[PDB]
């Protein structure tokens, strides 16, 4: 009636440019370079 | 050469008493080669030992010795593991924790070569993680991985020469065999109960500060305490002294509903014998010693001498005790007490055991095995005898053998595992030169003789019933009951006949005949005696 | 500011003299004399008896009788997780404050109390003769290794309440860890009188109890 | 001498030999140190360190113990009080055992031989199998007694016996002792009752030749021959040997004289009252009546011995 269990975790490929810096790319492309 | 030993360390400072031989052996085998000049050691070409193990009954001074030896060496500080403190849930993180202990030594060896300092590692409660490599089936498997990592790191392809591992355990039989070969853990020691000199030294050590400040009254004598307490471990002695001090301090303090202290008594504070005796009587109770409650529940109403057959049993018991105490070629003797029922044969065994002055006395009775199966009874008996094997002398009483076997006239039926565990335990001699004595009681000798259980026992004693009327009269006079004319009439009606009654039944007939009015006690007593006395 | 008359307990007027003679007697005497004596204070108590007779009450009252910090509470089987090596973390988390205070100061820290309920639930006998019980062994070892170990504590005290004194591991009930044990049995007449007085005093105060009773 | 160490060490592995050498070195070195209140090492006697043979024997007997096979402690445990010679029936058993052990080493038609020692109880059978096993000087010797299996169920006993027998198939030639058969397979006259699994395991293991070119010798002991004959087990053992009891006053006198008790006048006193009849008593009981007798006063000793001997009087 007992079974101890182990776990395995995974990391996340955190991306600086997947949101809020695509808007910053636009602010760098459409605004700064314009 | 900067001596591995701390520049100032004397055995008097350590504070351990009664462990001289063991410490000398440990120092000789695990420290000798690090204090000798190095050139000769280099010529001889030897590798230092890298393991020590300690085991024994709880509370005898293992963790004290380990801590003191760790403090002796003036080289870094010990790295402690507090049990199963190296364990996690993520896959592959216990092994990392195990590997982080040896890292510093690995790094230091390369930088310094052959001039490194000893690195110590203490493994308190080793038997929580290191077990038989495959005796835990059903778990996630961390045990096997941990054992393999430890084995591969202590003595692997790469070689270390500046480590020392110490282990402590109470059960030195579950630990893995592959971890106890002459390469990894060589020196294995047992810490056992001290003898008289050990107790004397321990009591000298503990009650030393009080002597310094004249807080100990001259009335106390250490030799009396040393002789009076038998089979006490160190922790029990410490508890005794602490209890005495606590009682002495509480004497002066006044009031409990409002805490108050009087300086007049506080200034003049001293501990006397009375506190020690009270603490000995009431508070502290050993585990491998003798207890005063076992002899107050079995021998209830003392022992009276109703006749001649009473003294013979005691004399023969004394003779057997003397034989077992002062001889060799005979370290295990047993005796069987048998007779008709209700005869008083379970009190005489207790009295004989108590009159022996053996340090360790134990009574195994079926009162404490109600509802147990066969295996439970076997385990209980084995544990009792295993404990009995741990003293210089002993005495074990087996009570009402016919109830242990679970006999019953119909069939017949009984247990077989119990019978065999009992038949093979009456011939196993104790280890080394340690004595033993076994006293068994029963009420049906013929059935036992038919089981071939009369070969194991070395002798037999017969406990008879009250037979001659004079013995009955003597018992009645001694018990303090009907006297004067009443006694006379009883005699008139009893001398001219034969009587056959046990001693445990008279105490009930007497008490049953005392609830009538003070005019028919004698008549009722005689009627009951006639109705009971079926002389066979 | 505290007196027994305000404790609220009635009947256990003798089984409280000992617990205030072996467990607290060495914390009220002038410190200098005790230091000169060089003794070590007790660090354990075990109470047992029939169920529903005034055990937890003594726990709360002794806990709040001292200036000690507010008691912690481990609620028996609240320290059993499912992942490997999670019970031991729960057990170890109890002594963190005690260890930190002992390391920071020395011979000055305030008493820390740990009220342990249903000790029999987990602290079962370790056993021997091959075979592993399971997780109970690891918890028992991790508990035995902290009260008494290579590192010394002198500012702790543990209280254990249960009604089966013969199912607890023997290695735990030795002088040095859970030494003092007490039995709290059924009360005789005077106990009942005091209990009834204590429980009806409030009503008697406001003239709400008739004189016929 | 290296050869003496090579011969003495039995069932040692390389780590064991290294540990023995290291322990001898440490013991030899420890003499110079003086572990007084302060650690001191002598610098004058030093540089003259010499390892002596006595150190090697001390290390052998105190600080190194192998873990494959039996060791001297078990032998000293079973054959406890020596082997005296109370007459001719003592040499015959040893001679027969010697002939058997000689057979089981220089022949190939019969790579398995079994023998059985039988006699009355309390007669000294478990202390004559040990001597025969010891005197053979075989490489691997193991004793399978039932006092190491207290409380075991049937399966556990079967597994233990199987493991002990498997440990003997990985050597060149070995001897195994099964003492007190009647107790391995539980037996009790009422019923009768016993274990069947153990009996079947033994009856199959007694006729299982080992791998090619290896030999074995099994010595078994028992006290109740007829029951074994009735289980159809006594036609599996190759031969049989009988171990008798003291059955004549002259042998009793010889045993008393050699043991070293009741000397001078008391011996003649016993001879007067012993030569007029026959006796029937095993050699283990005779070592207990003597100790029971030697507890009274300096006088009143021969009387008790003769009384106890008279009470313990029976015959076939
Ligand atoms: N001389 C005596 N010898 C033995 N017991 C005595 C003697 N005088 C008084 N007694 C009392 O008699 C009782 C002895 O018998 P006990 O009560 O031990 O039962 P028992 O003999 O073991 O009985 P059972 O055979 O029924 O188990 C005890 O109360 C003992 O105090
Ligand atoms: N000539 C002898 N032969 C055998 N044993 C002897 C002899 N002389 C002395 N002894 C002693 O006799 C004892 C051997 O008897 P042992 O206890 O082995 O009897 P047993 O027949 O195996 O007993 P049981 O069947 O009751 O277990 C040992 O103490 C041994 O020292
Ligand atoms: N040989 C000894 N000399 C002095 N005191 C001892 C000795 N053995 C035990 N003691 C005392 O008893 C206690 C033993 O407890 P300890 O050894 O720490 O626990 P354990 O036996 O489980 O390792 C210590 O507090 C110590 O004061
Ligand atoms: N000695 C006592 N004096 C007064 N009340 C008591 C006493 N013992 C028990 N009680 C009453 O019992 C109630 C509950 O007791 P409880 O703490 O549950 O005991 P337990 O934990 O042993 O069951 C309390 O409300 C209290 O009033
Ligand atoms: Mg410890
Ligand atoms: Mg009885
Ligand atoms: Mg409660
Ligand atoms: Mg035998």
Author numbering:
A (entry chain H): 181 to 214
B (entry chain C): 205 to 740
C (entry chain B): 212 to 424
D (entry chain D): 425 to 740
Sentences from the paper on this structure:
Supercomplexes of NSF, α-SNAP, and either a syntaxin tetramer or one of two binary complexes of syntaxin—SNAP-25 reveal atomic details of SNARE processing and show how sequential ATP hydrolysis drives disassembly. NSF comprises three structured domains connected by flexible linkers—the adapter N-domain followed by the D1 and D2 AAA+ domains. Six NSF protomers come together to form the active form of the enzyme, a homo-hexamer.
A representative 22bin20S model (class #19, 3.56 Å) and ɑ-SNAP—2:2 binary SNARE subcomplex model (class #23, 4.14 Å). A portion of a linker N-terminal to one syntaxin H3 domain is observed within the catalytic D1 ring of NSF (light blue). Of the five 22bin20S classes with the 2:2 binary SNARE complex, all are found with syntaxin in the D1 pore, while two are observed with the N-terminus of the SNAP-25 SN1 domain in the pore. Substrate-bound reconstructions reveal a flattened D1 ring in closer proximity to the D2 ring and a strikingly different ɑ-SNAP—SNARE spire structure than observed in the 21bin20S complex under non-hydrolyzing conditions. Unlike the non-hydrolyzing 21bin20S reconstructions, hydrolyzing 22bin20S reconstructions are only ATP+Mg2+-bound and substrate engaged in protomer E, consistent with a sequential hydrolysis mechanism (middle column). Except for the rebinding F protomer described above, all other D1 protomers are ADP bound with variability in the presence of Mg2+ and inorganic phosphate (Pi); in most cases, protomers C and D have ADP•Pi and Mg2+, protomer B is usually ADP-bound, and protomer A is always ADP-bound.
